[PDB]
Amino acid sequence: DDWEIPDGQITVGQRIGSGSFGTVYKGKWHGDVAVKMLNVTAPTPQQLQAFKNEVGVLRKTRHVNILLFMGYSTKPQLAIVTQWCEGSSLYHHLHASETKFEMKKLIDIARQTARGMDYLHAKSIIHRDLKSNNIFLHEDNTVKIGDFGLATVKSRSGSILWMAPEVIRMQDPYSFQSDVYAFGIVLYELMTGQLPYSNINNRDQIIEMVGRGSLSPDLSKVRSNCPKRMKRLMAECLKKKRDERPSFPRILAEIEELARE
Ligand SMILES: CCCS(=O)(=O)Nc1ccc(F)c(-n2cc(-c3cncnc3)c3nc(N(C)C4CCN(CC)CC4)ccc32)c1F
Ligand SMILES: OC[C@H]1O[C@H](O)[C@H](O)[C@@H](O)[C@@H]1O
Numbered sequence: 001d002d003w004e005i006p007d008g009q010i011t012v013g014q015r016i017g018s019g020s021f022g023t024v025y026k027g028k029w030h031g032d033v034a035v036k037m038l039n040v041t042a043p044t045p046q047q048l049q050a051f052k053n054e055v056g057v058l059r060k061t062r063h064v065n066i067l068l069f070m071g072y073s074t075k076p077q078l079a080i081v082t083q084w085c086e087g088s089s090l091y092h093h094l095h096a097s098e099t100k101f102e103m104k105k106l107i108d109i110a111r112q113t114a115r116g117m118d119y120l121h122a123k124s125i126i127h128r129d130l131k132s133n134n135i136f137l138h139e140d141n142t143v144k145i146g147d148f149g150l151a152t153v154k155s156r157s158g159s160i161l162w163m164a165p166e167v168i169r170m171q172d173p174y175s176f177q178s179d180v181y182a183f184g185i186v187l188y189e190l191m192t193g194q195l196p197y198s199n200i201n202n203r204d205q206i207i208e209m210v211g212r213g214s215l216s217p218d219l220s221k222v223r224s225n226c227p228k229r230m231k232r233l234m235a236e237c238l239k240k241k242r243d244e245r246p247s248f249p250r251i252l253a254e255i256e257e258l259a260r261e
Pocket of ligand 2: 125
């Protein structure tokens with residue numbers, strides 16, 4: 001219950017990232033921690049509630065593949081405290097760093113992401129923005145799912161590649177099934193090494209054609225050593241009709257089975 005950290009206990013160190021909604025620092029509190037402070041000094045009334053309702057969501061997560069919530073500050077600023085992870089995100093490894101993981105490692109990353117998502121969904125928490133940027137590889141080995149965006153307040157733009165067709169349409173939207181689609185696009189990333197729609201020049205073009213059903217990822221680009229179970233699972237996860245997509249228990253059980261072989 002006492003997840004509030006009193007004023008003065010945290011030594012806020014180097015600034016690690018900055019956006020409109022928030023700023024993230026490395027800091028000291030019984031060891032290393034990350035501290036995301038919200039860029040709003042005078043808190044608007046019941047925006048504090050939005051901070052409180054998130055704190056009440058993060059408070060419910062205890063799992064090795066979910067970034068460890070550790071506490072929060074109200075004074076001096078509104079702030080959220082997590083564990084400090086050494087390493088970088090799946091997005092950085094795959095698309096910036098040119099990291100070439102072995103298939104065993106690639107499946108292991110897909111496995112651990114599945115575990116974390118399965119856990120979240122089992123607690124009725126919908127992520128809403130699962131993507132390779134939000135999967136941190138701690139020690140470059142352990143998946144730590146979080147939400148590393150500092151641009152916007154969490155809906156509850158640079159995520160369109162992972163958005164399900166119904167989520168792009170906004171006809172009413174976000175659901176377990178939409179999270180599962182995003183995971184589909186992560187498997188694509190892992191198994192091809194590339195972002196989807198690499199040939200398409202324009203975002204508005206991706207929004208239009210994925211929304212109007214006329215564009216989908218090129219599944220033939222998967223590595224020649226991509227298992228058959230995974231290409232099939234990827235395709236089930238990417239299905240246009242929401243209700244045709246599998247749930248995480250069966251996704252996890254399928255990936256755990258393919259890892260064993
Ligand atoms: C319990 C889940 C809470 S959550 O949804 O993940 N939100 C959240 C709350 C508090 C936080 F501090 C955090 N949070 C934690 C970390 C972090 C952790 N370990 C180690 N480096 C960075 C973090 N990096 C962010 N970036 C955008 C950084 C990602 C790494 N890059 C390297 C070039 C610098 C920018 C944004 C929020 C971040 C958060 F993401
Ligand atoms: O607020 C919902 C949050 O649920 C979990 O803690 C996820 O790890 C995080 O990414 C998400 O933002």
